[model samples]
Target chain A: MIINNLKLIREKKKISQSELAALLEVSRQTINGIEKNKYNPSLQLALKIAYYLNTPLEDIFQWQPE
Target chain B: MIINNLKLIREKKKISQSELAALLEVSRQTINGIEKNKYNPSLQLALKIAYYLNTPLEDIFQWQPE
Candidate 1:
């Protein structure tokens, strides 16, 4: 499923998983799971990621192709 | 916007909103919202509903044209 939720934000801002995970107080695997759509994060985690990525939740996630 | 999540499950199993809500410990509004895709159920709630409906999660939820 290619939602491009985290991937779009990360690439737009030139951010990396390890870097963002450090700021979000999560493991790199967590970030990877989110970007890969292997996991659907909780609302709190999604909000945190959206804040760090400087994007809205809707912008990061949508009912897109998977 | 037709995910057919709750609607499919309810109709397939011949269950009613009030009946399911009584079983699941949620309100009829919650059930209605789920059927309408007005809300995304929490994983816990979704799993509970699936169990009661004798269905799988994958069948209940998917990214659709919304």
Candidate 2:
């Protein structure tokens, strides 16, 4: 599956990583890791991200057959 | 965040752990782990679960401030 549209959309919303981090109540590095796919964010966190980004879950993260 | 509604919803969906594991292409223990909050799942897998269960991510998992 393809990864996601996090950084691009976050930028489109004019929110910096630090700002997004604060919005999500997580560290900037956590936001970085999510965009980088450096680690897994729990489902709960995923939804919170979608909420704060003002995007649908599917819009932010899309699944494609590998 | 408060944990989740996995077992209840999975039961409501009439899907067993092993069966869910098969649908998600993960081990039964992986489903068990998510159900027990033993670990986190990637956003990718989380969305797959929501699709399979025909439930919203927020419905399956909820977040509450500590």
Candidate 3:
């Protein structure tokens, strides 16, 4: 029932949006959209995000009831 | 980015996986993934799934402050 994405990674890592975007080779706006839950990531980007999060992919995102 | 899909609609609709797959013209396995959040749907398929679920497209999915 949910499609909510985790923005906590940024907060947890103390990383700025622009900083994360740079790491991911994307525009800061892309990171902003991701944090705001306005856009979806492709499989590649998802993996990249998980790597940056230093977490198992499943921990970063989950399929759960809303 | 968040990339899970909502599966509660099928329960809400009281429809079997086969029934929903028939409606979407996709295989039952495809339906299973969407329900289990294994595979991501293309924009078109997402819209079709939303339509069949009888909910506003946005209501079915959220970009959210996850």
Best by TM-score: 2
- Top DockQ model: 2
Model 1 earns a TM-score of 0.49
Name the runs in model 1 displaced over 4 angstroms. A1-66, B1-4, B64-66
- Compared with the true structure, what per-residue lDDT tens digits does model 3 show for residues B1-66? 433445776777787777778888789888788777576654445556666765543444434232
Q: What lDDT would candidate 3 get against the real structure?
A: 0.61
Which portions of model 2 show Cα errors greater than 4 Å?
A27-29, A37-44, A64-66
TM-score sort, best first: 2, 1, 3
Tell me how far the alpha carbon of residue B7 in candidate 1 is from the true structure, in angstroms, after superposition: 0.8
Q: Write the per-residue lDDT of candidate 3 for residues A20-64, one digit (tens) a residue.
A: 788778898888887765766544565566567665434454433
Q: Each prediction's Cα lDDT score?
A: 0.66, 0.74, 0.61
Candidate 1: tens digits of C-alpha lDDT, residues B1-66: 225367777888889988878766889888887777577765556556666776654466543321
